[PDB]
Amino acid sequence: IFPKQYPIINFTTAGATVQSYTNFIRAVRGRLTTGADVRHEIPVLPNRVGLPINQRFILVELSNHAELSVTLALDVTNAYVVGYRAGNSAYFFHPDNQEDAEAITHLFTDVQNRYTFAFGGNYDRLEQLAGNLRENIELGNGPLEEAISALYYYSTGGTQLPTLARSFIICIQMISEAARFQYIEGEMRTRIRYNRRSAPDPSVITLENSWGRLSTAIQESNQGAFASPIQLQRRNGSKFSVYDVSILIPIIALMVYRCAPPPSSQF
Ligand SMILES: Cc1nc2c(=O)[nH]c(N)nc2o1
């Protein structure tokens, strides 16, 4: 068979319970990073520069209430959704470079049908197709169920790219972004409990737009002190400035590898 299969984590849009989602995200997090290499207490993702293909991706099996199954391919280096497998058909986003395309040539290799989009799943482009911004795309267990279904039905015919793109944006935020920020995870949990389905408010949006930035600052921050104030956005849109790692402790969960580690302070 394929030289070792990447670890898969299951999640179903059936028993909508807060803890099931918490366990889901928790598993994904621990599945991505080994736990070592933490810049100022915050965990760091493996550097792609020396990360072998056999340690490049993670899979997430999404079961729908109507017994549907889709498997997304997450990139360990930054929880990037590269594609998915709808049964025996696979779809991947247009890679940004050679190495990535070469790396992509490993996911769902046993598929009878394999395809690659002309566009990229990156928010900026994905939103164009969806014809709606993230602030107009609702999140929650409800929208998630719909999303998973849409991905599954792409291969049949009833696809509609706008809907397809929107479906991806949902899965991305609820799975990937939720793992990146404990804060976002909480937002989804709040929704699920009260069976609430709503669009991500300013605070959530900004964090997504600042993941890499924060990762850079947190790593280059001497003794935790941020070299320059990073203006984040509050729930009502009003901007507030962050000055230290301390504030981000309960917020950010995972950081992308930026620079070389310090004198291996993790022990
Ligand atoms: C976390 C994450 N953000 C994105 C994005 O914007 N696009 C794609 N394709 N995958 C992602 O994964």
Side-chain angles (χ1 to χ4, degrees), residues 91-228:
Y91 289 85
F92 301 90
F93 295 118
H94 183 59
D96 298 312
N97 70 292
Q98 181 194 90
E99 296 75 72
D100 284 354
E102 186 272 325
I104 262 58
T105 328
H106 293 268
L107 292 306
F108 317 120
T109 41
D110 63 298
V111 289
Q112 186 177 103
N113 309 107
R114 202 174 192 278
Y115 308 103
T116 304
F117 297 117
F119 60 91
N122 42 81
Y123 291 132
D124 54 280
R125 172 59 187 136
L126 212 57
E127 291 176 292
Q128 296 174 48
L129 259 183
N132 279 285
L133 290 64
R134 305 161 226 150
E135 56 196 75
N136 307 130
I137 298 176
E138 292 184 31
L139 300 176
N141 196 111
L144 187 59
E145 182 194 330
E146 307 175 322
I148 305 172
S149 184
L151 301 183
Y152 173 92
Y153 287 105
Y154 193 135
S155 41
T156 64
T159 306
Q160 298 298 286
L161 285 177
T163 306
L164 178 277
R166 185 174 62 201
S167 300
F168 274 125
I169 300 181
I170 301 175
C171 300
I172 294 174
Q173 295 176 89
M174 290 195 68
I175 301 179
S176 306
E177 297 295 326
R180 294 146 87 94
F181 292 96
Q182 303 170 79
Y183 181 88
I184 301 177
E185 172 192 23
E187 300 289 297
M188 296 302 105
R189 283 156 53 163
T190 307
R191 283 178 170 77
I192 295 177
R193 192 165 197 115
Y194 298 113
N195 189 53
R196 194 193 314 287
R197 52 183 298 155
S198 47
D201 44 57
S203 54
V204 180
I205 300 298
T206 305
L207 290 173
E208 301 170 338
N209 297 136
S210 304
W211 188 68
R213 191 178 196 216
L214 297 176
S215 297
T216 306
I218 298 172
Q219 288 173 71
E220 70 170 292
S221 57
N222 77 109
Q223 43 119 272
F226 277 24
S228 307

